[PDB]
Amino acid sequence: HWGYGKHNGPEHWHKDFPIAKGERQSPVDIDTHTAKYDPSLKPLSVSYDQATSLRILNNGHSFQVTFDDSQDKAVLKGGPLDGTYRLLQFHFHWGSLDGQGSEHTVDKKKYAAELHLVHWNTKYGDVGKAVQQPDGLAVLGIFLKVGSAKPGLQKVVDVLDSIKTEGKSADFTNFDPRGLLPESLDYWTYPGSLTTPPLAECVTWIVLKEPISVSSEQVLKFRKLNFNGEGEPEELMVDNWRPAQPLKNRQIKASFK
Numbered sequence: 001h002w003g004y005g006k007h008n009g010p011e012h013w014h015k016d017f018p019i020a021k022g023e024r025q026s027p028v029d030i031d032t033h034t035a036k037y038d039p040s041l042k043p044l045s046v047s048y049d050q051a052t053s054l055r056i057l058n059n060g061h062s063f064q065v066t067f068d069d070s071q072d073k074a075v076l077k078g079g080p081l082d083g084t085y086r087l088l089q090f091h092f093h094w095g096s097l098d099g100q101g102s103e104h105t106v107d108k109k110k111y112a113a114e115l116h117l118v119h120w121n122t123k124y125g126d127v128g129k130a131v132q133q134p135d136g137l138a139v140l141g142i143f144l145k146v147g148s149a150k151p152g153l154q155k156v157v158d159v160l161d162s163i164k165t166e167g168k169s170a171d172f173t174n175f176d177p178r179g180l181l182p183e184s185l186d187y188w189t190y191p192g193s194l195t196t197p198p199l200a201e202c203v204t205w206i207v208l209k210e211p212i213s214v215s216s217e218q219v220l221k222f223r224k225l226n227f228n229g230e231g232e233p234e235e236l237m238v239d240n241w242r243p244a245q246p247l248k249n250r251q252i253k254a255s256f257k
């Protein structure tokens with residue numbers, strides 16, 4: 001039922017998910033001048049050398065690449081985190097035009113898209129249990145700007161024609177998520193939520209300062225996907241982003257000066 005349209009979009013979500021108006025919702029505007037440099041923050045540890053991608057799926061809200069999270073193969077640790085977080089999946093949010101699409105904003109600037117690498121804390125054993133905990137998930141967010149192509153994204157965009165509509169999926173092995181990362185691991189961090197229903201307040205957000213560049217042709221392939229199932233009226237999967245939510249009683253910390 002929920003989606004991104006006029007009648008079922010983000011302003012409606014609180015009716016099914018009342019935490020939508022809670023105290024630690026995501027995304028937020030990152031006011032770069034108000035973020036506090038915290039010299040006690042550690043460098044982020046991203047260990048993706050043994051990542052095993054499995055499948056790529058159109059879920060009717062975005063597309064996602066799912067990983068084998070049954071062992072510690074692709075993990076996030078360090079930064080603001082305590083313990084080890086396993087990579088479950090990545091997905092994107094994007095716009096109908098290049099001036100919107102990101103969920104987080106930086107001094108009110110919207111990027112063309114935002115990549116989310118979703119990880120869960122191994123202390124809770126499974127993602128279902130982790131979503132019920134205030135430190136259950138760590139999501140690494142990366143902004144996409146339009147310019148030069150990202151070579152490491154191309155394997156992903158080339159299979160999107162095979163998952164056009166909601167419910168389609170395909171085998172998607174040997175995809176290396178290291179090829180989606182920018183040079184710097186400088187980050188902002190704050191406590192927040194899932195940006196899609198159920199909007200659970202379980203996420204340590206880690207948002208990279210450095211965007212990656214993708215080409216117009218790459219982002220145009222995102223915009224050919226459909227929210228609808230095959231046999232329903234065609235509704236392009238664009239503008240699948242939640243807008244910035246109130247910061248309330250939170251401080252955004254920066255790993256860098």
Ligand SMILES: [N]S(=O)(=O)[C][C][C][C][C]C123[B@]45[B@]67[B@@]89[C@@]1%10B81%11B698B746B814B562B%10%1143
Nearest residue numbers: 116118127131139193194195196198
């Ligand atoms: N946009 S985001 O905040 O990166 C989404 C983060 C969570 C994605 C993975 C999920 B959410 B809860 B638990 C796990 B199951 B249920 B719903 B289902 B989706 B998958």
Ligand SMILES: [Zn+2]
Nearest residue numbers: 091093116195
């Ligand atoms: Zn997301």
